[PDB]
């Protein structure tokens, strides 16, 4: 398959953590002397389908802020998924971390501007993202934000993904009709990238602080939403309201919001 490499060609490093779709390494890829993250699974179990799912899908995505697969293990166990290294690791904890003086409000917009770029990317190919959210962007040097990409699905035929009955949702970060329905489309990433938006701006704070998950659906149909995060440039929050239409059509494209930020961005370094 050409994706696929020898198991002995990577030497494992440490564990970064996981659990989870499996857990994840940090690694040497010797031949390149090339320290990579890897994703491992222990043994066959149920979760062997999922694995594959995810290796598939990242073989058919190429973009400068998506995470770049490097090569695959899948012929037996244990098995690896194997990634480029993001340096910083999760831009939730990163977000949490920073120096703000040094990750400032130039940067933020950067940020953005970077992941609206994978995400148009996403949208022309008819992918979409199963959950995006800071916790699944990984971030690099100087401020360089990929976003993961294990959890795609190509729309095959059609607008809309559905998922399985009896799927749970980070509530917080899921569009009105995913929570409904069970119904996933390109604009149901849009809502979540507003979401998406929101950490960014409060240095990743949770979405709906001290809000009772129950009731967040509930208050959605009502039409709240979060409220401006302080310091956030007005024209930043429109685009979060933007995402956060009730219906779907009503959103903008990832195109007009990609186009939007790299132009606030240019203007930002000006
Ligand atoms: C390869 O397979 C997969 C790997 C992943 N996950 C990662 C990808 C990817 N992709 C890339 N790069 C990662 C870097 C990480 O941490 C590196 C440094 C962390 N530090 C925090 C403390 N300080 C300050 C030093 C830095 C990390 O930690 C958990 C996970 C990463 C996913 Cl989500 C899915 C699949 Cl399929």
């Given at each position: ?104 409000a130039?940067?933020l917009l950067?940020?953005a ?81 507003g979401?998406?938006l929101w950490?960014?701006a ?23 939403r979060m409220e401006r995060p302080e310091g956030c440039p007005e024209k930043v929050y429109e685009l979060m309201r933007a995402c ?16 939007a930020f790299?132009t606030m961005?240019?203007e930002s370094?000006?």
């Amino acid at each position: 398959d050409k994706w696929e490499m020898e198991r002995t060609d990577i030497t494992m490093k440490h564990k970064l953590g996981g659990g989870q779709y499996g857990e994840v390494y940090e690694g040497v890829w010797k031949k390149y002397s090339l320290t990579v993250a890897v994703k491992t699974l222990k043994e066959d179990t149920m979760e062997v389908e999922e694995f594959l799912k995810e290796a598939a899908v990242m073989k058919e995505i190429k973009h400068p802020n998506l995470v770049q697969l490097l090569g695959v293990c899948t012929r037996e166990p244990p098995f690896y998924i194997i990634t480029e290294f993001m340096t910083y690791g999760n831009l939730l904890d990163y977000l949490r971390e920073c120096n703000r003086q040094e990750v400032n409000a130039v940067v933020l917009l950067y940020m953005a501007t970077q992941i609206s770029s994978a995400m148009e990317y996403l949208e022309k190919k008819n992918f979409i993202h199963r959950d995006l959210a800071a916790r699944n962007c990984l971030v690099g040097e100087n401020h360089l934000v990929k976003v993961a990409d294990f959890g795609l699905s190509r729309l095959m035929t059609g607008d809309t993904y559905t998922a399985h009955a009896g799927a749970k949702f980070p509530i917080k970060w899921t569009a009105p009709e995913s929570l409904a329905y069970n119904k996933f489309s390109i604009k149901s990433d849009v809502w979540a990238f507003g979401v998406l938006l929101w950490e960014i701006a409060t240095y990743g704070m949770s979405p709906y602080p001290g809000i009772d998950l129950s009731q967040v659906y509930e208050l959605l149909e009502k039409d709240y939403r979060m409220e401006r995060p302080e310091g956030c440039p007005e024209k930043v929050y429109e685009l979060m309201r933007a995402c956060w239409q009730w219906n779907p059509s009503d959103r903008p494209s990832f195109a007009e919001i990609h186009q939007a930020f790299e132009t606030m961005f240019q203007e930002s370094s000006i």
